[PDB]
Amino acid sequence: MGPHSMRYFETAVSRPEEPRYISVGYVDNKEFVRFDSDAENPRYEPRAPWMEQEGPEYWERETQKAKGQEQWFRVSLRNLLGYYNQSAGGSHTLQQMSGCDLGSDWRLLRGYLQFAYEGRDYIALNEDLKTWTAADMAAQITRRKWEQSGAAEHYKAYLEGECVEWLHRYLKNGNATLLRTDSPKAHVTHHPRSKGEVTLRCWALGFYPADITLTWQLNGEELTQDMELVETRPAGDGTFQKWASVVVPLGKEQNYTCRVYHEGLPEPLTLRWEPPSTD
């Protein structure tokens, strides 16, 4: 759904051994490439099978770039120790998210470049792709350095250019697979509680992509705070699961309906609990 996007999520973790560097690329929220410095032969690898349309030169070039990034994160973690007046030791985490959302003219809609240190927002490039916002005092040092050295122009050129150009290539190559959806298979289960009341649980299983909406109604009217939802979770086969439950009075089960919305469904599913047939 929505605009097409590309993202690269990068992490460098220092450990009590040099930092571990991990880079994961996404197209439309689906992992498509991955580099991990802790692998036996560290290289960018296809994570979506349609990426095998690329030749061996693509993987070698991406791998060489990852080697540069690994060094950049290593130097940056070292500068970060100095900013917080620390000597080397323990574990520290530096993360980066970057990428683009594709506009209706196939040009950049929104560009992203954000950093976190120790799980806290550190610095980000603003929407204008020209200015920075620093979150703390150490980040103000990075901000002044990047402003004085013309860093934003380098990132803007990537976001507006290369990022959008390659995203279009990936969308073309992965078209068949990328448009694919797996509709949720839905059902309602009935469970006992403490005094005879009933838990109705609406299950949505085996769906793809992960985005979904589960709702409960009592006589067609939406239920809000009485609804328990679990966070969407991976089934392990590339598909997802979710459930939403309501506590109802016994014998009043038929007055309730669940409705599931998903991009795989031509029409949202409306279902109710019915006692299953038994022997």
Binding site: Y8, S23, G25, V33, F35, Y44, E62, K65, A66, G68, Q69, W72, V75, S76, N79, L80, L94, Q96, S98, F115, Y117, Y122, I123, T142, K145, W146, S149, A151, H154, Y155, Y158, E162, C163, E165, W166
Partner: peptide, 10 residues
């Protein structure tokens, strides 16, 4: 295509 960060480190 992954990004190569600018020459200025954090």
């Amino acid at each position: 295509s992954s990004l190569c960060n600018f020459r200025a480190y954090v």
